[PDB]
Amino acid sequence: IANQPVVIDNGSGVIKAGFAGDQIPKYCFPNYVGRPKHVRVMAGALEGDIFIGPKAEEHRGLLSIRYPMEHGIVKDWNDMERIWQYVYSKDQLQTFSEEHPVLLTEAPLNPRKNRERAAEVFFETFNVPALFISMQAVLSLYATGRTTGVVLDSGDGVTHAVPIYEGFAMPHSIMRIDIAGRDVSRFLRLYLRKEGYDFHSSSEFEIVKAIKERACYLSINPQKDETLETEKAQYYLPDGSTIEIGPSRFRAPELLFRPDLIGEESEGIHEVLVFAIQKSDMDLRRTLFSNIVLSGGSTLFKGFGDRLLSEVKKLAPKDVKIRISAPQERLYSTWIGGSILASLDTFKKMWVSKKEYEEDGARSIHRKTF
Amino acid sequence: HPMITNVAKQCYERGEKPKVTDFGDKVEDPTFLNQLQSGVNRWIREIQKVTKLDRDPASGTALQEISFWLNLERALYRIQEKRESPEVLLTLDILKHGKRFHATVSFDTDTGLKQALETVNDYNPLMKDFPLNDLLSATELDKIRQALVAIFTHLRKIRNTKYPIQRALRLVEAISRDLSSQLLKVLGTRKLMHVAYEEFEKVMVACFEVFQTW
Amino acid sequence: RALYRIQEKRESPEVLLTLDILKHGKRFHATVSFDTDTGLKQALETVNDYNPLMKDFPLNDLLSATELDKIRQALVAIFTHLRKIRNTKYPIQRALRLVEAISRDLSSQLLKVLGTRKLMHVAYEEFEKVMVACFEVFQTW
Numbered sequence: 263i264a265n266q267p268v269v270i271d272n273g274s275g276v277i278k279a280g281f282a283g284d285q286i287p288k289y290c291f292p293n294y295v296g297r298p299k300h301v302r303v304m305a306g307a308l309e310g311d312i313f314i315g316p317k318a319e320e321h322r323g324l325l326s327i328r329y330p331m332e333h334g335i336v337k338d339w340n341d342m343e344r345i346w347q348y349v350y351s352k353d354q355l356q357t358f359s360e361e362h363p364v365l366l367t368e369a370p371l372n373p374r375k376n377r378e379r380a381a382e383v384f385f386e387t388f389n390v391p392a393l394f395i396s397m398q399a400v401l402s403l404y405a406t407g408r409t410t411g412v413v414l415d416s417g418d419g420v421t422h423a424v425p426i427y428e429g430f431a432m433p434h435s436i437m438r439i440d441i442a443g444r445d446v447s448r449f450l451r452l453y454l455r456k457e458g459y460d461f462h463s464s465s466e467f468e469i470v471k472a473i474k475e476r477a478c479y480l481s482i483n484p485q486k487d488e489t490l491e492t493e494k495a496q497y498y499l500p501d502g503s504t505i506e507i508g509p510s511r512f513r514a515p516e517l518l519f520r521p522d523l524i525g526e527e528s529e530g531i532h533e534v535l536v537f538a539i540q541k542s543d544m545d546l547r548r549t550l551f552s553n554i555v556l557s558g559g560s561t562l563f564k565g566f567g568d569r570l571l572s573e574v575k576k577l578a579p580k581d582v583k584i585r586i587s588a589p590q591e592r593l594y595s596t597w598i599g600g601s602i603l604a605s606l607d608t609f610k611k612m613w614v615s616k617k618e619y620e621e622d623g624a625r626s627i628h629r630k631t632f
Numbered sequence: 633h634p635m636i637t638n639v640a641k642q643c644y645e646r647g648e649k650p651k652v653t654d655f656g657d658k659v660e661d662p663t664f665l666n667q668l669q670s671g672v673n674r675w676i677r678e679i680q681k682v683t684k685l686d687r688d689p690a691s692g693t694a695l696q697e698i699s700f701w702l703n704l705e706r707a708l709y710r711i712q713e714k715r716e717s718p719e720v721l722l723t724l725d726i727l728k729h730g731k732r733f734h735a736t737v738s739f740d741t742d743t744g745l746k747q748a749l750e751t752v753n754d755y756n757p758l759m760k761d762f763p764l765n766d767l768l769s770a771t772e773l774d775k776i777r778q779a780l781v782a783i784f785t786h787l788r789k790i791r792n793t794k795y796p797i798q799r800a801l802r803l804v805e806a807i808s809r810d811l812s813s814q815l816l817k818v819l820g821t822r823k824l825m826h827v828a829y830e831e832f833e834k835v836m837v838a839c840f841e842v843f844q845t846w
Numbered sequence: 847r848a849l850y851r852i853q854e855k856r857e858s859p860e861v862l863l864t865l866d867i868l869k870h871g872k873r874f875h876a877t878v879s880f881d882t883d884t885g886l887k888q889a890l891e892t893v894n895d896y897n898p899l900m901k902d903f904p905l906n907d908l909l910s911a912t913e914l915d916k917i918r919q920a921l922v923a924i925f926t927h928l929r930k931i932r933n934t935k936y937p938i939q940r941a942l943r944l945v946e947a948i949s950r951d952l953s954s955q956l957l958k959v960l961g962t963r964k965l966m967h968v969a970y971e972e973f974e975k976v977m978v979a980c981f982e983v984f985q986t987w
């Protein structure tokens with residue numbers, strides 16, 4: 263027995279937290295730690311060397327930004343502990359961690375040590391009554407309400423196509439690549455450098471991320487738009503200066519469909535989806551093609567749906583209906599799924615209890631997650 | 633919860649029943665709902681402290697067992713009354729409003745109050761008219777035999793009462809212990825030394841008639 | 847609690863109006879000193895950081911224990927609660943001094959219970975039972 267479970271979808275880009283049963287995640291904030299890089303000289307300056315959440319965004323020019331997660335894998339565990347502490351602070355969730363079961367999310371095919379260390383942190387440092395490390399794609403499909411389909415979740419750190427049959431994620435058909443929104447923004451930074459506009463600072467990488475979110479689109483025909491004269495839309499920087507983007511506007515999100523633009527010999531996002539579908543059973547391929555669900559932030563590019571549909575039709579067999587679903591709540595689909603799962607009474611039978619972790623350890627999460 | 637108590641006081645002063653809407657935006661406050669749910673968890677713990685009670689049938693006399701079961705029924709009905717009170721129902725309704733269904737479903741089922749009430753009511757026919765008061769008050773061998781026959785005539789009603797066979801057997805052992813104590817006390821007062829042998833034969837005839845009835 | 851009371855007083859309209867009036871008169875000495883030299887922010891941070899360890903300490907169970915098994919269980923609870931120090935930023939030397947103090951309380955409680963036991967008066971087997979219970983308490987420690 264414990265309080266209402268707390269859902270924490272910890273992405274590489276932004277963490278989304280709330281209590282189970284809420285319609286949307288009420289507590290969303292970027293997943294980075296900001297530390298001041300300048301010299302504090304006077305009394306009355308900003309307090310604390312660690313800035314997380316909207317306090318980091320308000321003073322963004324003052325801070326060096328560090329991302330703990332990279333490609334869905336926690337690289338700095340002290341920063342991850344700080345961020346999860348902030349999730350429980352008086353600014354977010356206003357509650358003690360010793361009272362609420364947690365439903366953490368983890369991207370598929372992650373390292374085992376990542377899940378083990380996450381459970382160790384959540385059971386030792388935060389002393390949670392219970393824990394359940396879920397997978398993002400199956401939760402997104404639960405949020406959509408369907409039971410069978412393919413979830414092509416493309417987040418900040420990792421993109422992956424996961425087919426689910428009657429609620430069970432087929433584990434031998436999961437396709438994953440590490441090219442995601444952060445890679446697209448790094449590519450955009452490189453192209454802006456090739457256009458004369460140079461950004462170095464970790465705080466200016468957030469300006470590059472904003473440029474990606476604001477003025478970038480996917481052209482239906484890359485070669486046709488490539489040869490034509492560009493329009494050079496102008497973007498207003500935070501300081502008031504302007505920059506003319508031009509060809510970098512559409513070649514930056516092209517990285518999702520062509521990783522070879524950065525020398526990676528990995529599949530494209532359309533190839534990820536189609537190979538996940540074609541690696542599954544021959545009986546399920548028709549219903550998997552007829553049920554494709556987009557998710558994550560990187561699926562919000564202008565013209566993403568039409569471009570992916572064209573690519574999948576190019577790769578898919580003929581006489582097979584293709585229906586890519588792009589719900590409005592793509593950013594919070596996986597969190598809404600975690601909230602739906604945690605509301606059920608069956609979730610009581612799913613979590614690893616605190617005593618179970620105390621007596622077993624990593625094996626408890628290893629059997630219970632799978 | 634103090635806030636629920638204050639709102640109940642306010643709505644009773646107006647001569648109206650309480651409602652979820654009387655709290656307004658406080659129903660959407662996550663901290664308030666978390667406090668209510670923690671209180672409901674505490675209530676579940678306290679109710680489980682009572683509904684999980686049991687007593688070893690070997691230890692203590694049969695009167696102790698019957699008193700324990702009757703008091704268990706008396707406390708379970710009191711808890712059932714307290715669960716239906718306006719304050720508890722209002723707390724549950726508020727928690728249901730915020731989609732905190734875990735607390736409400738647990739309070740319905742996890743308490744075990746329904747199972748405990750069903751079992752204690754199933755035990756009711758045996759404890760309702762258990763006639764050991766006559767035996768414990770009996771001071772003559774004829775009255776002891778009559779009380780024993782009544783005790784077993786009442787134990788005849790165990791067919792339509794759920795009871796463990798081993799527990800009923802230990803209860804019969806307790807009845808035997810009480811019979812032994814009563815016979816010892818009665819025969820102690822007879823002062824066998826100050827009376828003749830024919831009355832001794834009568835007394836032992838009555839005692840062994842009681843034993844054959846047993 | 848006292849620091850929370852002081853903070854609540856600081857946010858009251860009277861204090862804010864006084865500081866605003868002093869700012870409008872360019873009397874920045876008092877306002878800057880009030881903002882910085884109080885130490886209220888650092889004290890609030892420290893006590894709030896320490897609160898999880900101090901919140902609901904089970905020391906009373908050790909102080910109210912009158913039997914050796916109860917003392918052992920209270921010690922288990924006390925050390926399980928002291929394991930919460932990781933979440934805080936409590937000084938470790940201060941934690942060791944707190945452990946010293948908990949040892950002092952354990953010694954006092956054991957002395958009280960053994961004084962009620964009257965060890966030398968009772969038979970030897972009862973003495974051995976009390977001794978093995980006490981040494982189980984020490985092994986638990």
Ligand SMILES: Nc1ncnc2c1ncn2[C@@H]1O[C@H](COP(=O)(O)OP(=O)(O)O)[C@@H](O)[C@H]1O
Binds near residue numbers: 276
């Ligand atoms: N409207 C948008 N257009 C393009 N990219 C976006 C948009 N909104 C968010 N993003 C990108 O999506 C990423 C966040 O996606 P999200 O689903 O939060 O990932 P995660 O699963 O790691 O939480 C960010 O890196 C951001 O660059």
Ligand SMILES: [Mg+2]
Binds near residue numbers: 271272417
């Ligand atoms: Mg995600």
